[PDB]
């Protein structure tokens, strides 16, 4: 047992094993002769479930005495993961639970493995909402979470023939002990209709009514007895030939059936404007009830903040107004004041194909009212700019809304900011980017709505939770307030000489390579050199994020060692995973290309074990947990400027592992924290890849210049990681040669140099070491805490507290 | 007075001050009353000179008793500048002769400005010579160096209009006070004549003589009562109408009248081969005298060592099988295996235009039977070839001494080889670069006689004396050990992060650059900046060393500040000196350059004192020994690949300043040594180099992606830097344009983006000055020390002794 992990004390081991037995029996219905792992887990899950009750209903019943300027964050994804665990860290029951298991002889890490993940999310987006609840409820903060309850969250990943397939992530098969129904707040919500224009007001009538139903799961603070709510709706039919009736309510039902699986990529399909448009309309109605039960909604503002996730929630904007001016029959102006001083939009990229641009026509038929709402809010915006600045045409259509050409559509980011008191970046590359380019005409009209808050992660999971190690050997040298004031690591700095802590960082590590190694042994049958420098990236597949710049440096190191096979050079094992979208091609075959330079690599006598390449198969959170604590190297290298912030980048920072990347996203921000020394930086700027545009992108130059990325180009044209299949990857060779949107060529060549330099510094132990110091030391800026903190200062005017609740 | 500059005994410092004023009465014939600086200088001189008389005689009586194998260093060029200081440090008798002449009323620092610099050199090689001598008396070696003694050594540099004006050196004017004339040992040196062949061997008559006078200056080791000889020969015409035969006595002596100014560049002038054979006629007959008065010459090689310094002494080896065969009657392969034991080359450049082939026209009349010998050599040499490889006839032309074509010519590099049993490039790098390209037949053939020397410095002259502030806050920590024993600055390592030391160091620094910003006005007239980043490129002006690049980047800076002058930027003094050979016009161009961006940037009322350049005027010894201790930045630009080694890169590594450099000479190990974190590295490596030869170097490719290189083009071009003549430039643009031979261009972003990283160093002190600790306690491996105790070891076959001789 280690400190961190909190006290075993004899009466709460105690009275946890009875109430383990207890939901053995009365609540799985089983006995200890027929009890499985699984029976066990739930026993468990329900045992520490009981310790949140009481919290959850005091901290609830505490916010409406209080009645605080409640948070809602609207976001489409939370990419939760398993909740054991972390429910166990934050109430300080780690250890007593880990006593407790031992003492009825079971072992609770088995048992911690059992738990689905919740997957309701994709990646980076998904799993900044979860950090970001998880902060918000250590904050202090009357915070609440509204998303969709999707039946299937995001596919779990199998390959076969080194190709991706996927299956349905049917997580609630077992039941999910966290959550809890709540059919008696159910609420409507309306699709389809026409409106009627009466003599007093406009009428959203004939429509198609959507039953809402609300799960609520809790989120508990770190160590604060504070236990804030997600609300997850969830689609349900009302209850008014007969068999196909109710056979075709599963149409209606499917609206909260399944995650759409793309990270970064629109694809305008209706079924997911209805989720859009479902998670808006319940939430607004849950959060004006809660409001009115506190009617003068000029201080709507001051009890209610509304913060979108991206452009997903967009619809809350007009779903605002039409309620405030359809239903309560608050002139416009006044509405339009209240929606803009609640509303707030974050803003997660600058890829054009991940912009929204939902087609009028859909628009008009699913939410007619909306449309209207959205035309009027428009025509008002634009004339504001039209006075600004007068005579120019161009700025006015370019800032529309309403999107001209074959087909009109509405550009929601443009309602976002339009809508929005605040607007944000996620890491100041980004937010900057945003003012100089994508937003350059709105930043000129209202300087004062864009702002900056760089993503966090929370340090609960991924530091004290998934590499409990590290946290001791931290928490041995200067305590434990860190965990929720991250910036306390900077302490670390004074021990960068000490001998001791050197030897306990790299022992450590050593020690989560060893358990990662064995871990793919045994629930994947595959062997790997734990001596070997592990170099990772892990992430979703996408072109952008250049896994295919990995692949060329790869191949790069085997044709070396090929030439000069007695020649001595570190070892490494290369892991490489992700998802890729379903019905993203190219990323699909990034995937193939991976496993087949396995297949290749890994059996070539010559190499040995000292190159491997694995493709690590279904990333998920849980997987990131075991990974990301074993890693040495991180690779963030995705084109300067198209990775808006990226938050792996920062777990990686935070366990560990030296950072190999371009000067995108937090990467600039990290290494302005660490010091550029001790980060492994390379290729072209923000402003070298719009030089190379101007001048136009030319792949053959390097192709010429390059004796080594030629002789990569032909191996994989000619077969040579294809036999049976010799043209297999002539779609990724003709893209890398002729419409590469990503320059992937362009930064090859310090790629490679800047490798070199990681192996140098990985033959020096002791170097490694202490660099590896250095950037765990200046990791603090990016903990989800101080995101938060700024978030609730300078968007939603609230103050965070670090206060306990009573118990 | 500081500790390192030995003791100011009561009874020593009366003996001084009694012995100066004997001097000052007796041999200048002076009475305190008229006596001038110039007189007080010359006493002092005489009085420092008596100190070492006793230890010469008895060191020179040593060597004839124990009769050690003596070793001889043939060079053209000893840039040996002052030598009053010099000998006062080696003598411990420095605290003692400023305490004695301080309580004269005199000023110590006052006098030893008024001695001339000996400066019988153009740069590395001659400086080489010098340190070399320094290190071999301090290792207690029987050398002797031996040389010409120049009546005008290198020019001394004017700058008129911004122009480079020469002006003879006539360092001898008032008379050289550490010289000894030995008109006793005055030896014949013949040319011309013709070849006779007699029935017992061949005779070189009808011969024209001129006789060669040795004159002795003593060479005192460090504080160990060796006092070495370095012999320089003179020209005298033997004493056999009448006035103009008088008259005529000139046209010989002029042998020994002046140095050639061509540095790492080859000039056929028959004076120049005519002062080539002198040296080497005269240096032999004394080397063999000396050997019969210790005949078999099969022990010749075991007291006889003859290194030859680059080829310019060359002809030793025909001219030692001429008296061997000729006057001694040996069998020719008898001579000749004494001839290869004997000699040893050590190569200094690989730039085409350096290397010496002189016209077989030219040796035909001037030395015929050498003609005759060479031929025979090379003919015995071309069998050998053809035995090793049969039937390779492009070897055997390739290999010859003799160079067929338009003009016959004797390849005196081939004749090195040949003659020699080692031969030694002058850094790791440049010796690999010998095996791999210039001499690999040679290599290929005799692989044992290919060996490295990298190159040193004297850590007395270049460190004790020229910064004893520094030397001595380094004595306070580890001793006085290291002044003989450079490598013990490892020791220093332990300070680097003693907040004391880093205060020191950066003190003695700070101390430095005011001491010289005062002198800049003093003896200028010219204000400059101390708390600027004093960034200084002194040594000869030549195309590969890329003054060029340097200026480049200076406009780009001025550029930038004009772009957008309310900025800040780190202040900057950029320093460049060195003398352009005479007749070498793209050097002068670039002077001329220099002073012009000087004129824009100095007096441009936006820079301010953020931007100063200043070219430093006759850069020589004496002011090397003034600006380096005062830099810190070392600008070591060279196209990796063309500087054989460098040196003045070791001097600045060694007081303190931090180095921008390209992979060239002994930049790689120096970067080796102190760590390439430590050390500002960039652009092309040899291997990068080629790649760009063999595509083919087209400069309009970077003036065309690069907006600010273009700029800066264009303003040369137009006139911007010389109004009333537009063109004045042209010469320079059209050579970087269409041919440059040394890839400015190609270097220029890299370099530009490491000068930023420099920049950015500077405004953090304590980090700027624990990189410059790190820099000069891995400076140990540069004291020539190490390098003639490799040579001794490795290719005289002698043992290097650090015992004191007695007193
Ligand atoms: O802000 C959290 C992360 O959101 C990611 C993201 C952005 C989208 O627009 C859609 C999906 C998605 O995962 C960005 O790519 C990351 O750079 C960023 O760190
Ligand atoms: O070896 C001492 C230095 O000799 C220099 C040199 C070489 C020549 O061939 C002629 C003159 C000359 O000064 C090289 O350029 C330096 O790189 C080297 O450090
Ligand atoms: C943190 C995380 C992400 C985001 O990773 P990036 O490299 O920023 O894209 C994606 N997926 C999972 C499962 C994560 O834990
Ligand atoms: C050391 C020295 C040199 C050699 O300088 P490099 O930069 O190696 O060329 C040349 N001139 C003088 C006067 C020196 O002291």
Redesign the interface.
């Known amino acids: 047992q280690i400190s961190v992990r909190g006290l075993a004390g004899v009466e709460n081991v105690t009275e946890l094993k009875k109430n383990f037995n207890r939901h053995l029996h009365f609540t799985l219905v089983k006995d200890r002769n027929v009890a499985t792992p699984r029976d066990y887990y739930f026993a468990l899950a329900h045992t520490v479930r009981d310790h949140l009750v009481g919290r959850w209903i005091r901290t609830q019943q505490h916010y409406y005495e209080k009645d605080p300027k409640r948070i809602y964050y609207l976001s489409l994804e939370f990419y939760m993961g398993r909740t054991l665990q972390n429910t166990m860290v934050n109430l300080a029951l780690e250890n007593a639970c880990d006593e407790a298991t031992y003492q009825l002889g079971l072992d609770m890490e088995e048992l911690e493995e059992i738990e689905e993940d919740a997957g309701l999310g994709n990646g980076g987006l998904g799993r900044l909402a979860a950090c970001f609840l998880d902060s918000m409820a250590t904050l202090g903060l009357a915070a609440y979470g509204y998303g969709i309850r999707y039946e299937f969250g995001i596919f779990n990943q199998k390959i076969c023939g080194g190709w991706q397939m996927e299956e349905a992530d049917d997580w609630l098969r077992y039941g999910n002990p966290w959550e809890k129904a709540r059919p008696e707040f159910t609420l409507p919500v309306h699709f389809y209709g026409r409106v009627e224009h009466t003599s007093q007001g406009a009428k959203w009538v004939d429509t198609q009514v959507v039953l809402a139903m609300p799960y609520d799961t809790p989120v508990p603070g770190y160590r604060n007895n504070v236990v804030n709510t997600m609300r997850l709706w969830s689609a349900k039919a009302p209850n008014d030939g007969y068999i196909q009736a109710v056979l075709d309510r599963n149409l209606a039902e499917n609206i909260s059936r399944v995650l759409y699986p793309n990270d970064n990529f629109f694809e305008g399909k209706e079924l997911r404007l209805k989720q859009e448009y479902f998670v808006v309309a319940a939430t607004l109605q849950d959060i004006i009830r809660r409001f009115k039960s506190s009617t003068n909604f000029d201080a709507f503002p001051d009890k209610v903040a509304i913060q979108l996730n991206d452009t997903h929630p967009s619809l809350a904007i007009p779903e605002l107004m039409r309620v405030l001016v359809d239903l309560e029959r608050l002139d416009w102006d006044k509405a339009w004041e209240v929606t803009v001083k609640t509303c707030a939009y974050t803003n997660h990229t600058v890829l054009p194909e991940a912009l929204e641009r939902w087609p009028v026509h859909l628009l008009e038929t699913l939410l007619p009212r909306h449309l209207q709402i959205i035309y009027e809010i428009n025509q008002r915006f634009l004339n504001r700019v039209a006075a600004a600045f007068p005579g120019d045409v161009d700025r006015l259509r370019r800032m529309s809304l309403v999107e001209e050409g074959a087909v009109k559509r509405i550009n929601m980011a443009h309602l976002c900011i339009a809508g929005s008191h605040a607007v944000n970046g996620v890491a100041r590359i980004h937010s900057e980017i945003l003012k100089k380019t994508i937003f350059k005409d709105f930043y000129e009209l209202e300087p004062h709505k864009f702002q900056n808050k760089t993503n966090g992660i929370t340090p609960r999971r991924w530091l004290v939770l998934c590499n409990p190690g590290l946290a001791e050997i931290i928490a041995e040298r200067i305590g434990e307030e860190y965990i929720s004031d991250l910036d306390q690591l900077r302490k670390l700095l004074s021990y960068v000489?000490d001998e001791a802590f050197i030897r306990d960082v790299a022992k450590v590590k050593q020690e989560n390579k060893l358990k990662f190694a064995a871990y793919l042994e045994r629930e994947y049958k595959v062997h790997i050199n734990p001596n070997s420098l592990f170099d990772v990236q892990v992430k979703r597949i996408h072109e952008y994020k250049r896994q295919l710049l990995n692949c060329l440096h790869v191949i790069t190191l085997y044709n070396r060692i090929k030439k000069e096979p007695n020649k001595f050079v570190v070892p490494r094992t290369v892991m490489i995973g992700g998802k890729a979208a379903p019905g993203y091609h190219m990323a699909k075959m990034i995937i193939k290309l991976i496993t087949a330079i396995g297949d290749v690599v890994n059996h070539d006598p010559v190499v040995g074990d000292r190159l491997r390449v694995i493709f690590l198969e279904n990333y998920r959170v849980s997987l990131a947990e075991k990974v990301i604590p074993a890693a040495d190297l991180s690779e963030q290298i995705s084109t300067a400027g198209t990775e808006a912030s990226g938050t792996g980048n920062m777990k990686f920072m935070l366990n560990g592992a030296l950072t190999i990347g371009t000067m995108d996203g937090a990467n600039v921000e990290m290494a302005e924290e660490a010091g550029e020394?001790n980060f492994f930086i390379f290729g072209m700027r923000v402003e070298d890849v719009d030089?190379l545009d101007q001048?136009g992108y030319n792949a053959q130059e390097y192709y010429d210049?390059i004796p080594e990325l030629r002789q990569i180009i032909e191996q994989l044209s000619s077969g040579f990681f294809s036999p049976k299949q010799p043209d297999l990857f002539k779609d990724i060779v003709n893209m890398l040669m002729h419409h590469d949107r990503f320059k992937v060529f362009a930064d090859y060549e310090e790629y490679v140099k800047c490798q070199e330099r990681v192996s140098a510094l990985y033959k020096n132990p002791r170097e490694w070491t202490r660099m590896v110091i250095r950037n765990i030391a200046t990791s603090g800026k990016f903990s989800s805490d101080r995101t938060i903190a700024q978030y609730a200062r300078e968007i939603w005017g609230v103050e965070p507290s670090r206060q306990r609740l009573p118990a």
């Open positions: 000489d020394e030089r001048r210049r």
